[PDB]
Design a protein around this ligand. Sequence first.
Ligand SMILES: CCCCCCCCCCCCCCCCC(=O)O
Length: 161
Amino acid sequence: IVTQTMKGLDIQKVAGTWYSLAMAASDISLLDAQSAPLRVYVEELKPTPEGDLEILLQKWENGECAQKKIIAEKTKIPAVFKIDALNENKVLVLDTDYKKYLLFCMENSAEPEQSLACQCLVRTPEVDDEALEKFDKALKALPMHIRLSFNPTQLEEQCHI
Ligand SMILES: CCCCCCCCCCCCCCCCC(=O)O
């Protein structure tokens, strides 16, 4: 689905702290409740030396904010990782400048029109208008039906409460 990938991605340089400033999905149900399936809040990226990606994040489940750890495995495409879970879940890095913003989408492997969610990550708990502008331009193709964004207070709280 996603026709935008970052050329020349250096996965080591995305290490460190990130904030999920905005999210969007193809289906309202993927993001509507606090416990919605792709309502996830990125905490940090931890690239391994072989070039896989450990992801720390928070997710609300059963009435509280839970910390999760995910391994995205590398593929032959530098910008595309596989989540390793039951669903053939692919993560694509659309664009990043390493020091300010990273845009990524995650999609299901097939069925036929399928689930897709994308986030605008930023390095600091600040509304970055230019990064949100790149996020919205990246998505104006994609068939999104829900979009969320968060204010700096929420960005400093667990599960953006
Ligand atoms: C590649 C650099 C960008 C960072 C990508 C972050 C991708 C989160 C992927 C999370 C997928 C959904 C997790 C669902 C909760 C875990 C579970 O229920 O098993």
